Specification:
This is Plasmoredoxin. One of its GO terms (molecular function) is protein disulfide isomerase activity. InterPro entries: Thioredoxin-like_fold, Thioredoxin-like_sf. Pfam families: Thioredoxin_8. The protein has one domain: Glutaredoxin, CATH 3.40.30. It has helices spanning about 35-50, 65-75, 90-95, 115-120, 125-135, 150-155; strands spanning about 5-10, 15-20, 25-30, 55-60, 80, 100-105, 110-115. It has six helices and seven strands.
């Protein structure tokens, strides 16, 4: 069993969502931490991104020291998030240097834009990205129990 639930805040309650919800969706993997000053700044770029690409689900991959930092971060954003844990193995799989990082993922787990944090910080990208998404043709992929995250995060 791997990564059965993700989490979010709604109605002043911490809530869970079955990870099967994310099947067949484009994803934006946001690696960050509440203690990382540039990660907090990056939220402003992510919010512009989301309005222009509303079908992309933003997922917070956390590197907070404490659970209470994590809860604060989840509350102040409205993002979905992995459960609070140690995710350095995800950094290792994709050879992630620093925080913040932001990867765009297609519905079959293939990477659309690996270095998307630097792209969306140029603040002049919407037109190329829209044509990129238009021109990249996707072959769907099924996963057991409609859970894509073992393939995405583990070997």
């Amino acid at each position: 069993n791997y990564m059965n639930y993700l989490y979010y805040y709604q109605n002043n309650e911490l809530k869970k969502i079955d990870s099967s919800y994310f099947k067949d969706k484009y994803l934006g993997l946001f690696f960050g931490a509440s203690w990382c000053k540039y990660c907090v700044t990056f939220i402003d770029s992510l919010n512009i991104f989301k309005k222009n690409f509303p079908n992309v689900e933003i997922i917070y991959i956390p590197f907070d020291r404490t659970y209470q930092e994590y809860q604060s971060f989840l509350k102040n954003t409205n993002f979905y998030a992995l459960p609070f844990d140690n995710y350095l193995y995800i950094c290792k799989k994709y050879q992630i240097k620093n925080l913040p990082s932001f990867m765009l993922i297609t519905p079959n787990n293939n990477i659309l834009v690996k270095d998307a944090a630097q792209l969306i910080k140029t603040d002049e990208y919407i037109n190329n990205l829209k044509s990129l998404i238009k021109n990249y043709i996707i072959h769907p992929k099924t996963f057991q129990f409609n859970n894509r995250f073992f393939d995405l995060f583990r070997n």
